[PDB]
Amino acid sequence: GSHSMRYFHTSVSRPGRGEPRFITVGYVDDTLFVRFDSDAASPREEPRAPWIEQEGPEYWDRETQICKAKAQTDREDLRTLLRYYNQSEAGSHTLQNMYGCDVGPDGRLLRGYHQDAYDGKDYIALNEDLSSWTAADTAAQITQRKWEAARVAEQLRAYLEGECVEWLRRYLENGKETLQRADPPKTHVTHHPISDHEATLRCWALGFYPAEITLTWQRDGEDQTQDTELVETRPAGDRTFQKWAAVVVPSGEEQRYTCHVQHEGLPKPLTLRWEP
């Protein structure tokens, strides 16, 4: 279908406890494929999916060099940000970066991304045009001015339209067994008495990939979304995900309620009921 690639990066300063901790991971869709952690013995970027293992030594060398360089850039930038925000050197702070690209079924660029956050809030983002910036505040405007002067947006555009798309396409082909397979949810409804008067109906979806799914309850064909407890989609630890949706219902009225499941792995939406 459509596909995405993303690289995520987090640096966390720890004054008095050495250099910042730096962790970066890469994903294609909802599949982790590479990782780097600065607090490994002698750190290297490492494979986390079978289809990336075939890349040669030069790939891993280059990736590792980039990861180490990013860590060092972040280390300096954390110091810079204490100046920009008139902060003391005493506390731990966080820099996060994401970048990557989305492609359509034909493999053409749909959207590119590059965005940074300080202390868990937006700092500066490349706009969808891959040409202009959104700065969150007057500190980030200082960054924006430097990046405009250095024509950074144009450099990112060249990567995002070029290598990002080209390498995503390579990974999708090499990983076609898994990246191009949707596993449908295994579904069922359970019943959990609360009293003689009422009970929870819980609609389960298990073992699905990718993570995107919709689960809803209806009563007599009307959505119950204000009354539905819907847990966050959660990883099973293989490659698959889990989710459930629950409604509290009066005793004897269970057959009024239907659960509806949409997922890319399913031909048509499912409709399910409690089956005693």
Partner: peptide, 9 residues
């Protein structure tokens, strides 16, 4: 694969 270039804040 990752980008080669980056720039200080």
């Amino acid at each position: 694969r990752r980008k080669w270039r980056r720039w200080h804040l």
